[PDB]
Amino acid sequence: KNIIIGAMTALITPFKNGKVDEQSYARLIKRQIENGIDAVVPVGTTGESATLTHEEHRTCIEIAVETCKGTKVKVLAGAGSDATHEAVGLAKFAKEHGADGILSVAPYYNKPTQQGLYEHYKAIAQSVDIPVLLYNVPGRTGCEISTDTIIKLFRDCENIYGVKEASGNIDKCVDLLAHEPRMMLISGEDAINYPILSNGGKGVISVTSNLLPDMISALTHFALDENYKEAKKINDELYNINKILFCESNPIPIKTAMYLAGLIESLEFRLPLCSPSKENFAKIEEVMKKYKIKGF
Amino acid sequence: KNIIIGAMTALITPFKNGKVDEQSYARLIKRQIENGIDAVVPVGTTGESATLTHEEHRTCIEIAVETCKGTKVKVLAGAGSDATHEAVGLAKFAKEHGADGILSVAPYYNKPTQQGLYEHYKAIAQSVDIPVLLYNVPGRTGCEISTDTIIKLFRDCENIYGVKEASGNIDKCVDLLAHEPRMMLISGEDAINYPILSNGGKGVISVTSNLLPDMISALTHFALDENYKEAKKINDELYNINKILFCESNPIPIKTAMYLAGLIESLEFRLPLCSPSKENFAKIEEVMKKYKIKGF
Numbered sequence: 249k250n251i252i253i254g255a256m257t258a259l260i261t262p263f264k265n266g267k268v269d270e271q272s273y274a275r276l277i278k279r280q281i282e283n284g285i286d287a288v289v290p291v292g293t294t295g296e297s298a299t300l301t302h303e304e305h306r307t308c309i310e311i312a313v314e315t316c317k318g319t320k321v322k323v324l325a326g327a328g329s330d331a332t333h334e335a336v337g338l339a340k341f342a343k344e345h346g347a348d349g350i351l352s353v354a355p356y357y358n359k360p361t362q363q364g365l366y367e368h369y370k371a372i373a374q375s376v377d378i379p380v381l382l383y384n385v386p387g388r389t390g391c392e393i394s395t396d397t398i399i400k401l402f403r404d405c406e407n408i409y410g411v412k413e414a415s416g417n418i419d420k421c422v423d424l425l426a427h428e429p430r431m432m433l434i435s436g437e438d439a440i441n442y443p444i445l446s447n448g449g450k451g452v453i454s455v456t457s458n459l460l461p462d463m464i465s466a467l468t469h470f471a472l473d474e475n476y477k478e479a480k481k482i483n484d485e486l487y488n489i490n491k492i493l494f495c496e497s498n499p500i501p502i503k504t505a506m507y508l509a510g511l512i513e514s515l516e517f518r519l520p521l522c523s524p525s526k527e528n529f530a531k532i533e534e535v536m537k538k539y540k541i542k543g544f
Numbered sequence: 545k546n547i548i549i550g551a552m553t554a555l556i557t558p559f560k561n562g563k564v565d566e567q568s569y570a571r572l573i574k575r576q577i578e579n580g581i582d583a584v585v586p587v588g589t590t591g592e593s594a595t596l597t598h599e600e601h602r603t604c605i606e607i608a609v610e611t612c613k614g615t616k617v618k619v620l621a622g623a624g625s626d627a628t629h630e631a632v633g634l635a636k637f638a639k640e641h642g643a644d645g646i647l648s649v650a651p652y653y654n655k656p657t658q659q660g661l662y663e664h665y666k667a668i669a670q671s672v673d674i675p676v677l678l679y680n681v682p683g684r685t686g687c688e689i690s691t692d693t694i695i696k697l698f699r700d701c702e703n704i705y706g707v708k709e710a711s712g713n714i715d716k717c718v719d720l721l722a723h724e725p726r727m728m729l730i731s732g733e734d735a736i737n738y739p740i741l742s743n744g745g746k747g748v749i750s751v752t753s754n755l756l757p758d759m760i761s762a763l764t765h766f767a768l769d770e771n772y773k774e775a776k777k778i779n780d781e782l783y784n785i786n787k788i789l790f791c792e793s794n795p796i797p798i799k800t801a802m803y804l805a806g807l808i809e810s811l812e813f814r815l816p817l818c819s820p821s822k823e824n825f826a827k828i829e830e831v832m833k834k835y836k837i838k839g840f
């Protein structure tokens with residue numbers, strides 16, 4: 249299978265006066281490239297995929313593709329939807345506009361059955377010829393792609409090569425790689441990046457790497473090179489920031505931290521997301537002081 | 545406050561060859577009217593709001609408004625979204641096209657904070673002058689509108705008049721009505737319609753009433769008159785069908801039952817929803833044989 253693995257960043261989407269700040273978006277991607285990241289994910293959950301229009305979503309994918317061209321950094325485009333026809337349209341767009349692969353979150357809200365999830369992802373994978381990474385995040389979607397469904401999709405659909413797991417369930421990570429060791433398990437939960445990698449996971453799609461791309465990329469590369477002592481050392485050092493970035497729903501804390509570090513111009517969200525509480529604003533700012541934050 | 549209460553139906557959306565069957569849709573609404581229902585909810589969760597286009601969503605609202613003219617039956621239009629700008633657009637459409645009020649599900653997937661939920665619903669409520677019913681269903685959205693937030697919205701926004709609770713939490717139902725007895729608590733969980741109504745709830749937005757509108761209507765009107773013996777008897781009789789209609793994710797079982805009763809011509813869903821398993825198809829049919837199902 250063709251694969252996209254390694255240290256990857258779920259890019260925040262900066263806004264200016266209610267619109268996507270496209271110059272800021274490209275500048276932040278260049279900063280990821282300069283700090284060892286292997287791939288970027290435009291317009292995942294961290295990118296406020298829910299509140300972008302379909303046109304803005306496509307613009308962000310195009311910016312990522314253009315900014316990474318000529319570098320060895322890949323674009324794994326966010327393309328998920330709770331409607332299969334919408335996810336297929338996003339998948340086809342990402343393929344036609346030069347993305348290296350797509351990330352596709354399990355349908356939120358409408359709670360498909362396992363049979364429905366299988367048919368959903370099969371429709372997506374058959375619509376393109378680029379790699380497709382499944383994405384399980386039951387705390388947000390209300391459904392879980394079971395281990396059996398993931399493995400069947402991996403074995404039945406050429407392009408489906410692994411899953412981004414954001415479920416806090418290391419038992420399921422063992423289950424997945426014990427029964428299908430050929431798939432690419434990707435960590436979608438920063439605090440447990442190292443445990444997922446040490447069990448044979450092959451990358452991360454990180455929120456924290458927006459702020460600390462050098463540290464997340466180093467953790468991942470230490471682990472892939474089997475230097476577990478050094479990978480665990482960074483995972484341990486990052487625990488405090490990894491947890492504080494979820495003190496309110498992602499991406500409210502990471503955007504707050506990016507603003508506090510001077511990496512984006514304005515702390516702007518699209519409703520229903522909004523600024524953190526004053527208390528959480530202070531906690532994020534306090535935790536950040538312990539870390540060296542790279543500039544541009 | 546202007547209110548929409550009583551026995552209400554979360555309408556299924558029938559499809560024919562992948563398009564909304566608009567003739568079937570009107571016929572199903574007329575059947576609800578003739579069987580004692582007080583209001584209909586086009587394109588809620590049960591109506592596959594996630595997989596309709598915005599244009600199809602608007603078409604269904606219009607069919608409902610047209611079909612209810614000249615009757616006592618109100619149209620509480622589904623207008624929720626995980627993006628505030630989309631929810632405001634739907635609210636404004638429902639207002640301008642003659643809906644009596646709107647239902648507005650808590651944002652799914654992006655997990656707004658309580659502050660964000662407050663700002664989301666305040667924007668929606670200020671965009672129209674018709675009644676707004678909040679809708680809480682954490683199992684589907686990944687978030688929940690806390691009691692404090694519901695009550696603050698009820699007290700702060702003239703047209704927010706209550707909440708449809710689908711959370712299986714009768715303690716919260718006591719909490720809501722003990723601290724703000726003026727609000728309209730609406731059951732969004734058929735199995736516990738009678739317990740919610742007997743604690744002072746003022747209506748239901750029902751899945752089961754798609755199939756058994758006369759029974760849900762009678763249960764609700766018995767309860768509203770404090771004829772609790774009769775209301776409980778119907779709630780008890782309905783328990784088996786109420787539970788089997790959730791043996792797979794709603795609306796897969798209710799659409800299956802409507803098809804099994806000849807009330808819709810095709811057992812068609814939009815992916816990622818799909819037909820139930822053969823075993824659940826047979827289980828649904830077996831439970832249906834115990835109930836008296838009205839025709840057209």
Ligand SMILES: NCCCC[C@@](N)(CC[C@](N)(CCCCN)C(=O)O)C(=O)O
Nearest residue numbers: 297298300301302593594596597598601
């Ligand atoms: N990634 C950019 C598009 C975002 C669109 C949407 N806000 C809504 C998607 C939708 N399927 C629209 C249905 C419209 C008719 N009700 C949904 O709200 O579920 C989402 O997927 O979260």
Ligand SMILES: [Mg+2]
Nearest residue numbers: 254284285286
């Ligand atoms: Mg590299």
Ligand SMILES: [Mg+2]
Nearest residue numbers: 327328351353
């Ligand atoms: Mg996605």
Ligand SMILES: [Mg+2]
Nearest residue numbers: 612613614617
């Ligand atoms: Mg009227």
Ligand SMILES: [Mg+2]
Nearest residue numbers: 623624647649
């Ligand atoms: Mg709604």
Ligand SMILES: [Mg+2]
Nearest residue numbers: 758761762763
């Ligand atoms: Mg009667």
